[PDB]
Amino acid sequence: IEWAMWANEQALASGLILITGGIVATAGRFTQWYFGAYSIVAGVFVCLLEYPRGKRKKGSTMERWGQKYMTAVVKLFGPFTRNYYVRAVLHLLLSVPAGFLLATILGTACLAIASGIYLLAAVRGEQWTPIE
Amino acid sequence: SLEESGGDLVKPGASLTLTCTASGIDFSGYHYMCWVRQAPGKGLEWIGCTHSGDGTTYYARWAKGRFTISKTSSTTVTLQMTSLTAADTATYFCARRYVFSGGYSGLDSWGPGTLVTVS
Amino acid sequence: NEGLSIFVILVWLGLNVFLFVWYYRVYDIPPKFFYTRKLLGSALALARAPAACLNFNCMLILLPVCRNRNLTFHKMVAWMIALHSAIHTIAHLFNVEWCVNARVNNSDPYSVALSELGDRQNESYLNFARKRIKNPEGGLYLAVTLLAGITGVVITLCLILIITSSTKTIRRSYFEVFWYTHHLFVIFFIGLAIHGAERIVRGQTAESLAVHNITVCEQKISEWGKIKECPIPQFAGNPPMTWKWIVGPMFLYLCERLVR
Amino acid sequence: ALVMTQTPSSVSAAVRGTVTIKCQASENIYSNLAWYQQKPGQPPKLLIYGASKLASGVPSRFKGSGSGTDYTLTIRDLEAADAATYYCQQFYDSLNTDNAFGGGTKVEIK
Ligand code: HEM
Ligand code: HEM
Ligand SMILES: *[C@@H]1O[C@H](CO)[C@@H](O)[C@H](O)[C@H]1NC(C)=O
Ligand SMILES: *[C@@H]1O[C@H](CO)[C@@H](O)[C@H](O)[C@H]1NC(C)=O
Ligand SMILES: *[C@@H]1O[C@H](CO)[C@@H](O)[C@H](O)[C@H]1NC(C)=O
Numbered sequence: 225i226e227w228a229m230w231a232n233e234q235a236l237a238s239g240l241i242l243i244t245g246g247i248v249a250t251a252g253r254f255t256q257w258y259f260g261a262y263s264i265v266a267g268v269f270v271c272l273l274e275y276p277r278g279k280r281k282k283g284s285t286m287e288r289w290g291q292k293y294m295t296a297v298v299k300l301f302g303p304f305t306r307n308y309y310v311r312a313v314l315h316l317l318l319s320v321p322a323g324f325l326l327a328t329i330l331g332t333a334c335l336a337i338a339s340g341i342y343l344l345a346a347v348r349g350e351q352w353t354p355i356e
Numbered sequence: 357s358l359e360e361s362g363g364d365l366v367k368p369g370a371s372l373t374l375t376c377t378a379s380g381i382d383f384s385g386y387h388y389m390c391w392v393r394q395a396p397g398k399g400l401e402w403i404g405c406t407h408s409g410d411g412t413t414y415y416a417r418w419a420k421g422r423f424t425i426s427k428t429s430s431t432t433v434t435l436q437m438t439s440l441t442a443a444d445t446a447t448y449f450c451a452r453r454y455v456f457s458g459g460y461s462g463l464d465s466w467g468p469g470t471l472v473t474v475s
Numbered sequence: 476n477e478g479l480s481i482f483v484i485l486v487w488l489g490l491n492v493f494l495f496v497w498y499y500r501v502y503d504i505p506p507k508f509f510y511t512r513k514l515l516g517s518a519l520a521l522a523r524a525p526a527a528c529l530n531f532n533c534m535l536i537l538l539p540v541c542r543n544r545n546l547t548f549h550k551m552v553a554w555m556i557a558l559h560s561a562i563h564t565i566a567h568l569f570n571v572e573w574c575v576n577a578r579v580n581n582s583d584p585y586s587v588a589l590s591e592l593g594d595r596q597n598e599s600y601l602n603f604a605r606k607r608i609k610n611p612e613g614g615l616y617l618a619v620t621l622l623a624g625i626t627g628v629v630i631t632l633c634l635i636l637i638i639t640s641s642t643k644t645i646r647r648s649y650f651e652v653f654w655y656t657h658h659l660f661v662i663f664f665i666g667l668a669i670h671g672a673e674r675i676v677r678g679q680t681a682e683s684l685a686v687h688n689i690t691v692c693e694q695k696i697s698e699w700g701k702i703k704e705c706p707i708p709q710f711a712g713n714p715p716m717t718w719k720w721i722v723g724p725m726f727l728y729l730c731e732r733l734v735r
Numbered sequence: 736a737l738v739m740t741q742t743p744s745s746v747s748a749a750v751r752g753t754v755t756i757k758c759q760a761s762e763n764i765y766s767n768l769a770w771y772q773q774k775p776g777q778p779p780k781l782l783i784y785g786a787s788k789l790a791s792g793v794p795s796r797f798k799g800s801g802s803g804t805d806y807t808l809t810i811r812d813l814e815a816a817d818a819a820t821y822y823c824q825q826f827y828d829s830l831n832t833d834n835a836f837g838g839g840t841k842v843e844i845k
Contacts, residue, residue: 225651225652226648229644229645229648230645230652233640233644233645234635234636234640236639237638237639241635244561244565248569252569254610254611255572255581255609259611277644280648286644324611325611325614326571326611326614326615326617326618327568327572329618330564330631330632333632334635337636386696386697392836399820399822399838399839400771400773400822400824400836400839402824402832402834402835402836407695409694410691410693410694410695412691414830416832417736417831418833449779451778453826456784456785456788457697458785458788459698459699459700460766460767460785460826461698461767461769462781462783462790463769463779463824464781464790466778466779469778700765701766701767701827702767702826702827702829703827703829704829704830
């Protein structure tokens with residue numbers, strides 16, 4: 225069982241939800257829209273970081289459409305991305321500030337769940353190895 | 357303030373129109389604009405009102421069929437009288453029914469009134 | 476027999492579009508919801524039409540898997556549920572924001588005046604945001620206070636969980652996680668059945684339209700309750716309907732599982 | 736129809752005295768009443784706009800009261816300049832009403 229495979233998709237979904245909520249907040253000019261703008265930025269960053277899927281320890285994996293460019297970009301950041309404790313902490317810290325606005329509370333919850341799944345995966349000792 | 361134009365000696369059965377022009381008040385809020393008449397030495401008689409926004413107009417049962425109140429412009433309101441009789445001689449007041457904040461109404465602003473004589 | 480599959484997909488698309496447009500018309504044109512949409516813009520229709528489409532899709536979702544092509548249709552129905560739930564959630568986020576802004580003195584005067592209803596014993600409220608709390612804390616308070624808000628948050632979270640854990644990779648290579656976390660549909664349907672229990676989205680009562688005339692009393696907002704022609708309006712919400720759509724499939728699936 | 740009747744068609748009171756004017760509605764008007772003072776040859780002056788809510792510039796001397804169908808006007812310290820006529824107008828019903836104003840009461844200073 226590889227929890228990182230599900231954590232990646234959960235974080236990507238959380239990023240999409242954060243982008244949608246932030247777009248709704250900014251476009252609708254919700255009170256404290258700046259939290260919506262920050263949610264847009266955080267969701268975009270999470271999507272960019274999570275689009276490149278990792279590699280399964282056993283067996284092969286299926287690439288995401290145009291994943292090569294983004295995974296090559298992520299490779300350049302060294303162990304800050306390979307490690308999953310760092311990824312879980314980063315997701316939690318990016319989700320926290322996005323939870324002060326209703327439109328983005330759902331995105332915050334989804335990102336927190338993704339961070340929890342990453343922490344569970346990291347405890348097992350998994351890491352993100354780029355696919356070549 | 358308000359002032360009623362018109363008002364002159366009129367033969368019975370003819371028609372007359374009183375024009376109520378404001379000075380500093382615009383008839384575009386949510387207040388009404390009522391017309392009140394007072395025969396010499398008698399009590400006030402209510403003719404009808406005209407909401408500034410909706411345009412709905414109300415008249416007293418006796419004045420429904422022959423009195424027309426219309427807000428011609430943002431500052432002038434006209435009362436048209438038809439089939440005038442000797443009983444319609446009275447001082448006609450133009451009053452603004454100010455709907456205060458609580459929702460209760462009162463004729464805040466009154467016009468000096470114009471004598472109308474039918475004979 | 477690809478013709479049958481194409482016909483089924485086309486009929487599904489037609490029914491979804493027809494339901495969306497029909498319920499948009501129902502919640503947008505009629506004067507029953509005149510004040511409701513005066514307060515909520517078109518977000519009322521945009522939130523209540525995906526509600527009908529979601530009732531339809533949630534009825535459809537469980538039928539394909541009740542064995543006692545089909546899985547492709549099940550996936551399409553799930554993704555349609557996701558889309559309509561997205562539209563519903565966005566529209567209701569707009570509704571919550573505007574309602575909270577109106578409850579406090581931070582909206583247009585007419586919306587604020589409408590929001591004052593229900594503060595007295597013999598008044599039915601239109602603005603379901605009763606506590607006078609500013610934004611964004613007001614919307615968050617509504618989310619965890621209203622039964623609709625709590626249930627919506629829970630079922631939406633379980634919906635994203637199901638969708639993200641039902642991806643192709645997890646489903647082919649980690650079927651244990653997929654199957655164990657797919658049973659969040661139980662929470663989904665339990666929350667969805669009671670989702671509309673409170674009836675917070677309210678339109679003017681059927682009888683209130685007789686005593687209260689919309690075109691005669693639209694601009695007399697301040698005078699309601701103290702002039703004969705404009706009695707203060709009374710609002711009432713629709714009863715919960717989604718349980719009717721969802722109970723059938725739940726019973727069929729439960730019978731199927733008992734067979735298994 | 737809704738008819739208002741001011742029972743005290745003529746009341747007299749000495750200076751610094753009190754005058755009570757009662758204006759009772761034939762139908763339950765929900766406290767939407769107004770009291771006007773009309774000095775001779777002068778447009779009426781609004782005193783109370785609610786049932787008992789004073790208008791701008793009107794002292795606390797002129798008190799409104801009552802609820803439902805019975806309403807009252809009172810003058811604590813009736814002056815020599817209050818020798819006018821007082822009317823009551825109901826704004827609740829305007830659909831079918833012969834006269835909104837409740838007759839008229841003439842106040843005399845003794
Ligand atoms: C949105 C709400 C959803 C509900 C309520 C739901 C519910 C269900 C249920 C009850 C089953 C059968 C379980 C069983 O037989 O024990 C099932 C099967 C399945 N669903 Fe969904 N599901 C949803 C979303 C999705 C999504 C989004 C996908 C794909 C993206 C999906 C793909 C599948 C697949 C592949 C199966 C086959 C399971 C098997 O063969 O064992 N479902 N679903
Ligand atoms: C934050 C997310 C959500 C919020 C705030 C929300 C809010 C609401 C509200 C206020 C109502 C009206 C209830 C009433 O008037 O009684 C409603 C109805 C409804 N919603 Fe949502 N909802 C959310 C998510 C969802 C999701 C994920 C679904 C998935 C199916 C959904 C489906 C429905 C349905 C079917 C109804 C109709 C209920 C009925 O007619 O009884 N909603 N929602
Ligand atoms: C509400 O805010 C408006 C300005 O937007 C202000 O004029 C008004 O006095 C405030 N209070 C009420 C009760 O409307
Ligand atoms: C509310 O209505 C009931 C009956 O309709 C009545 O007995 C009660 O006095 C009313 N209370 C208020 C505050 O209007
Ligand atoms: C409301 O009043 C008008 C005219 O003032 C009338 O045309 C309309 O039919 C009335 N509404 C209803 C529902 O009868």
